[PDB]
Amino acid sequence: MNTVPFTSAPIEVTIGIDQYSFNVKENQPFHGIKDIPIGHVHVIHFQHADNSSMRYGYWFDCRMGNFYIQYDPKDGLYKMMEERDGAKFENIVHNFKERQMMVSYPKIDEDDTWYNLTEFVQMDKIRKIVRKDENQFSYVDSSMTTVQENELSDPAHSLNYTVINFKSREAIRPGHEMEDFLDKSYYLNTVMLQGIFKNSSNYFGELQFAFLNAMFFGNYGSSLQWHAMIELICSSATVPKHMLDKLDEILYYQIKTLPEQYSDILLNERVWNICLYSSFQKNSLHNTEKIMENKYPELL
Amino acid sequence: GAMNSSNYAELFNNDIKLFVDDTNVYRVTVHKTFEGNVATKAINGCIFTLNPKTGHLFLKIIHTSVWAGQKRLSQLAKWKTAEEVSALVRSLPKEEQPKQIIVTRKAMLDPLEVHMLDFPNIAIRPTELRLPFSAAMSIDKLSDVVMKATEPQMVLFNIYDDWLDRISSYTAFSRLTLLLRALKTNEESAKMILLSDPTITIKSYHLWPSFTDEQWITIESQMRDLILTEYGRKYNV
Ligand SMILES: O=C(O)[C@H]1CS[C@H](c2cccnc2)N1
16 A cells, blocks of 8 residues: 655645545545555546546555655645655654544455556656656646647647648558548558557557556547547558457446546547447447446437 | 639739649549459549649549559559649649649548648648539540540649730639630530631640630630530520
């Protein structure tokens, strides 16, 4: 187990940790989150009560350091920091009075959801999408644009997702225009998988990261990326068999977790209708189709 | 896009543009088979690529061999159109390459955009006008060269004949679209209007008769009358 101490909670806020969330009132005695499992990545996210504009948060790996949250009254946000002195942190965190002012990570044993949602997400790859090398943790917020969006305005504050653009020279071989536009297999297999991502794990990891950024922060560029990476697979006639099978599982857990009241804003009707009912891989997404149809029929 | 409401004069400015109409690329006759079924036979078609400022028509003849052994021909036809339009642009010196290509049907956008990815500064867009370019094959000399082709062939025409010696491109385009709309609406009567005077002929190197300015005014009036008459007949007005 690991712990995320908060110096204080000076402003009223909704705090999320992985898929869980709770409220903290202004100046409430709150010193953080206890009982967090290791091994994965995590995300802690915030939305201020008095201004629900800007959701923001931090992706982090407890294995990489001792992290804590302190409110910055100048910048007006909860900031993640690393405590270099493991002895002071062990002393703050084993402090019995201190854990009386914290919330417990409430993992139900049957629940494998967070691993299911983050299996292929890795901090090292996150820190390549979110470029801030002085910190072991990565900040993301609701407003951040993607590099691809910027190419259509602060490069330091951008999500450096892999550019996926169906109408680009990268996606289309000269002499194979119709073929490659109607069947994205070249773009998926040769360009993206062999060329850029190197393997399907890195691809799925960015797909999962994009989804989670879209869901936790309402980050629109991340939503676009998630949908694009799904559509690229579904619109390919040739996809390894393990990838489709694994894709069905990945999407199923994403759709299952998605807030029911967030469907009008996090799901692109065109893309989902295409993937489920018109695409080469329509029949390879059995479990995703079933949860979509029985959870979001209005969209289909 | 607009291209209407007093902003359609730009069509005839000095930025090079081409209209691309694919309506006559994939053409078929429909007949009954022996067993009783119905079968199509393809016939030669054409891509209609027009510079509205200069009247330069790039008529790419689509020979029926293009379709042999191919599936989903209506889809292929848009992609064949885009490949040929792209090839045309590439064949032209940079100073003659269009700044805009205006496709008459939205279905041509993606095939053309994809074939034109090497030309990022060429705008591709759907027309806002209803254009009668499908009636191009009612122009006898165009139909003749398409139906006689035994292979792929590009033929160049000035669809305005010598009119720009006397009128503006804006006026020529209006005359052209009036003629074509009349040919589309009542082809046999429009052709009789154009042939009413045996002493007024079509030059060997022209498509249209050699009307004087006043004769064109009369002809245009007759074409407008033809179009309005057909409207009345069709809608019982
Ligand atoms: O210096 C630190 O390492 C941080 C970690 S959490 C913390 C703290 C401070 C004051 C009250 N509770 C917790 N101080």
